Design a protein around this nucleic acid. Structure first.
Ligand SMILES: Nc1nc2c(ncn2[C@H]2C[C@H](O)[C@@H](COP(=O)(O)NP(=O)(O)OP(=O)(O)O)O2)c(=O)[nH]1
Ligand SMILES: [Mg+2]
Ligand SMILES: [Mg+2]
Ligand SMILES: [Mg+2]
Ligand SMILES: [Mg+2]
Ligand SMILES: [Mg+2]
Ligand SMILES: [Mn+2]
Length: 756
DNA sequence: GACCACGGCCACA
DNA sequence: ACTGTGGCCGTGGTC
């Protein structure tokens, strides 16, 4: 099983390393035969003698094109003759690529920025994370002496914790008497001891929570300020720091550092992403939080240091428990994209698609197009029409079916061969014309994009089937992961075609796909209402909610299944409508915002405040109860009563201040803000105290009783002391709770005055 | 000062 | 930095 690839330089020559794990043994395979290269498309196929001769300087050394070779590749759907330029070392390419492009005889260069170790995986056709090898994992967390003001790592690492299949342990230098704590003399002997552990257990995966930006760098600064060699690598190296955008990421050679923090946020939608919040939201059981003010006082006084030890052990224990959960899915993404788990676990959706496309492009001998430069990125800033959304027949509906298309956009690309390489091709024999936008797509040869999506959706439907044969719950989950992933990947391949900075950008392709989707959806809605007597209650991009006005449950289901047979026989090719559920009742407030309950009482809510992370809990909790009494028993009087009980709890300050916290994330640097809302205003006064306010941090503020702007009486929640503060009951009554339930109960005649 | 468009955030598909 | 569609609120201009 391949884990990762990199390269070293032996006497100026690149040497690929492949970090494998086979038969429970860690092996390092070397390849000294791979040559770096990129492509060049010249004006004449004869000037290459001059192109052989361009040189450049790197590090007191002239860089030269080693060898050249005539290649025929597929570019723009037609075979073009391209020139392959071989080099000695990968770092030669950036030092010479511009000197080549600037040559008049060459029009442009291609595939000049693909990293060596990743090109190896693509060209050599290798796929990491495949096989049945069980990787040895080990989590770790630390505890630190913090004071306000002192620079990063000014103080010491008080304790280090770790956890695996043998349990969790703690290592510190102050004497803490507990069965899972190991005491040593000093910090050195602690960090040195922790190194002895990792080297001894030899884990393939090092699991952390935010180790990319804290744990490893703290262990770095002390190790130098103290004089230890952090030989965590299996080659005897130290943790290697990279630059993942504004923030950083940490690699551990020979192993996979799995920072759960990027994985969690990108996967789960939580108002806060603390360890205690993430743990309790994934496993249901809560987790205690000891703060930095406590562990510093507990250290300098020596009092209640055992409480710090429990938290330290808990941190390591829970991150391991979380790592065992989220890693196997991240492994499937690695196999699907064809890049290391370390890379795909922190990659944006766009970059994951490009890597998938680049591998696909290499398999089909498709010369990859460059990324756009400034002028092209300026052009590609347009917009195009997307999915159709109807205005919901606002109110309460009964006996509803939801009919939806199977992968509507990827099925359109497949059915109509939508691809940049099939758009407006001359000499076409069979073409398909896009509605509204009139773009013609050649069907003589299968397009690049349709051929990949076809293989993906074919593999998706293969997985949704074999899953049923398999019995082991793990294989069910593992396989199910690939099923959902293929879908996100497929839709992102569509989104790639409209992406400003995408290599296979094609606005015509992108807007043709949506144009067909509008036609197929509105056609289906036309048929079901005219040829079958339905009334479409609400419809988003790929499906709709409909019912027979009046009628009975089965009558709605029977005619719905009849309509499906009629419409799926009239639907061209890979296009298909499916029965995706019956629902006893359903409330449709507005576009993107509705709630629905099935036959068994499962309430599904979409878009409403109850699901939005930037609303107070007291607002969600009561809208949930109002929706419940509305869809569970239709008890409108109990629903209107509930609003009256909670509104009196607020005015009498009986509701816990924790339920009135609004969580909103800042998205940019505070100088770049043009509108200071309450959450930004709070984050600006925090920057006046010198706190880390970076893009991505969540502001959690409560509004205090007072007058003026909201941003003048909003304080962070960790700053709220109930004895000294009183929250603004009037604000949360008139601006949070009542507005959220009135938009629902307005359909029943009730107004806010009737709810206070 | 009452009225209103609009950053800005997060959600749906 | 995958796409477009969309609801919603505090906040400042505006006559
Ligand atoms: N670029 C981009 N387009 C998207 C995304 N999500 C949806 N689209 C568009 C493109 C998608 O083709 C369309 C609908 O996507 P589904 O409803 O998630 N497909 P399913 O197989 O689940 O249908 P059914 O419900 O019957 O199982 O929304 C996205 O995240 N990114
Ligand atoms: Mg890597
Ligand atoms: Mg290229
Ligand atoms: Mg769909
Ligand atoms: Mg689906
Ligand atoms: Mg759908
Ligand atoms: Mn865009």
């Amino acid at each position: 099983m391949i884990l990762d690839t990199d390269y070293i330089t032996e006497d100026g020559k690149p040497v690929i390393r492949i970090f494998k794990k086979e038969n429970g043994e860690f092996k390092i395979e070397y390849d000294r035969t791979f040559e770096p290269y990129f492509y060049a498309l010249l004006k004449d196929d004869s000037a290459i003698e001059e192109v052989k001769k361009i040189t450049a300087e790197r590090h007191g050394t002239v860089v030269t094109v080693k060898r050249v070779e005539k290649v025929q590749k597929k570019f723009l759907g037609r075979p073009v003759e391209v020139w392959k330029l071989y080099f000695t070392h990968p770092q030669d390419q950036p030092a010479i690529r511009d000197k080549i492009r600037e040559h008049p005889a060459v029009i442009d260069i291609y595939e000049y920025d693909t990293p060596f170790a990743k090109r190896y995986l693509i060209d050599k056709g290798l796929v990491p994370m495949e096989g049945d090898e069980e990787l040895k994992m080990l989590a770790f967390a630390i505890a630190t002496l913090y004071h306000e003001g002192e620079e990063f790592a000014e103080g010491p690492i008080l304790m280090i914790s770790y956890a695996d299949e043998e349990g969790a342990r703690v290592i510190t230098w102050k004497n803490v008497d507990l069965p899972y704590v190991d005491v040593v003399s000093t910090e050195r002997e602690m960090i040195k001891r922790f190194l002895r552990v990792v080297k001894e257990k030899d884990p393939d995966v090092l699991i952390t929570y935010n180790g990319d930006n804290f744990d490893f760098a703290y262990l770095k600064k002390r190790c130098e300020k103290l004089g230890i060699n952090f030989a965590l690598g299996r080659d005897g190296s130290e943790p290697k720091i990279q630059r993942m955008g504004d923030r950083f990421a940490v690699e551990v050679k020979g192993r996979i550092h799995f920072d759960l923090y990027p994985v969690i946020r990108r996967t789960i939608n939580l108002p806060t992403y603390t360890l205690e919040a993430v743990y309790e939201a994934v496993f249901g059981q809560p987790k205690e939080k000891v703060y930095a003010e406590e562990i510093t006082t507990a250290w300098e006084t020596g009092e209640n240091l055992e409480r710090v030890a429990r938290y330290s052990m808990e941190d390591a224990k829970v991150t391991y428990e979380l790592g065992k959960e989220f890693l196997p899915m991240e492994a499937q993404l690695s196999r699907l994209i064809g890049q290391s788990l370390w890379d795909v676990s922190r990659s944006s959706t766009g970059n994951l698609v490009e890597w998938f496309l680049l591998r696909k492009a290499y398999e089909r001998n498709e010369l990859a197009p460059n990324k756009p430069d400034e002028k092209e990125l300026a052009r590609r800033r347009q917009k195009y029409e997307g999915g159709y959304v109807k205005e919901p027949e606002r109110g309460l509906w009964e006996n509803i079916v939801y009919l939806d298309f199977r992968s509507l956009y990827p099925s359109i690309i497949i059915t109509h061969n939508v691809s940049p390489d099939t758009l407006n091709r001359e000499g076409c024999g069979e073409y398909d014309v896009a509605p509204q936008v009139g773009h013609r797509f050649c069907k003589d040869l299968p397009g690049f994009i349709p051929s990949l999506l076809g293989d993906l959706l074919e593999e998706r439907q293969k997985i949704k089937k074999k899953m049923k044969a398999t019995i082991d719950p793990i294989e069910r989950k593992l396989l199910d992961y690939r099923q959902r992933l293929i879908k996100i990947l497929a839709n992102s391949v569509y989104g790639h075609m409209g992406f400003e900075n995408a290599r296979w950008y094609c606005k015509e392709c992108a807007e043709s796909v949506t144009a067909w989707g509008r036609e197929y959806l509105t056609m289906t809605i036309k048929e079901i209402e005219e040829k079958y007597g339905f009334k479409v209650i609400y419809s988003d991009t790929d499906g709709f909610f409909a019912t027979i006005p009046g009628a009975d449950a089965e009558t709605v289901k029977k005619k719905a299944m009849e309509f499906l047979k009629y419409i799926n026989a009239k639907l061209p090719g890979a296009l298909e409508l499916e029965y995706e559920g019956f629902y006893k009742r359903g409330f449709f407030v507005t576009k993107k915002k509705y709630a629905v309950i099935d036959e068994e009482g499962k309430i599904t809510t979409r878009g409403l405040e109850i699901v939005r992370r930037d609303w107070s809990e007291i607002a969600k909790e009561t809208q949930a109860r109002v929706l419940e009494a509305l869809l569970k028993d239709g008890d409108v009087e109990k629903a209107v009563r509930i609003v009256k009980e909670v509104t009196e709890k607020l005015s009498k300050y009986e509701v816990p201040p924790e339920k009135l916290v609004i969580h909103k994330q800042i998205t940019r640097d505070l100088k770049d803000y043009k509108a200071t809302g309450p959450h930004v205003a709070v984050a600006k006064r925090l920057a006046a105290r010198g706190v880390k306010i970076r893009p991505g941090t969540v502001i959690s503020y409560i509004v205090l009783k007072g007058s003026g702007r909201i941003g003048d009486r909003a304080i962070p929640f960790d700053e709220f002391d109930p004895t000294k503060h009183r929250y603004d009951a009037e604000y949360y009554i008139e601006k949070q709770v009542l507005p959220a339930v009135e938009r629902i109960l307005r359909a029943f005649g009730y107004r806010k005055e009737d709810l206070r």
